[PDB]
């Protein structure tokens, strides 16, 4: 799912949650909630994809 895919990519890029939050322009807590599967469709999906160097499709579907 998106939480495992987000974690996986930030690690590959050498980013901790705080760093990813600042790159996306959101709160640390928003990042935590996405990684813990609490939020599946954040408002910042396009910015998340860009910071992770991935497509939005990949994040959401895994294809």
Description:
Helices cover 65% and strands 0% of the residues. It has one domain: 434 Repressor (Amino-terminal Domain) (Orthogonal Bundle). By secondary structure, the chain is an all-alpha fold. It has helices at residues 2-13, 17-24, 28-35, 45-51, 56-61.
Structural class: mainly alpha
The CATH architecture comes to Orthogonal Bundle
State the CATH class: Mainly Alpha
Major beta sheet, specifics?
none
Kindly state the number of beta strands: 0
- Return the CATH topology: 434 Repressor (Amino-terminal Domain)
Order of helices and strands: HHHHH
Domain module count: 1
- CATH homologous superfamily name? lambda repressor-like DNA-binding domains
Query: What is the percent of helical residues?
Result: 55-70%
Question: Mind telling me the C-alpha Rg?
Answer: 10 Å
Shape: globular
Distance between termini?
A: 11 Å
Q: Strand share of the residues?
A: under 5%
Count of alpha/pi helices: 5
GO molecular function, one term: DNA binding
Subunit structure: Homodimer, when bound to an operator.
Keywords: DNA-binding, Repressor, Transcription, Transcription regulation
Protein name: Repressor protein CI
């Amino acid at each position: 799912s998106i939480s495992s895919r987000v974690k996986s990519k930030r690690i590959q890029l050498g980013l901790n949650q705080a760093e990813l939050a600042q790159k996306v322009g959101t709160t640390q807590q928003s990042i935590e909630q996405l990684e813990n599967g609490k939020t599946k469709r954040p408002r910042f999906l396009p910015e998340l994809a860009s910071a992770l160097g991935v497509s939005v499709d990949w994040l959401l579907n895994g294809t």
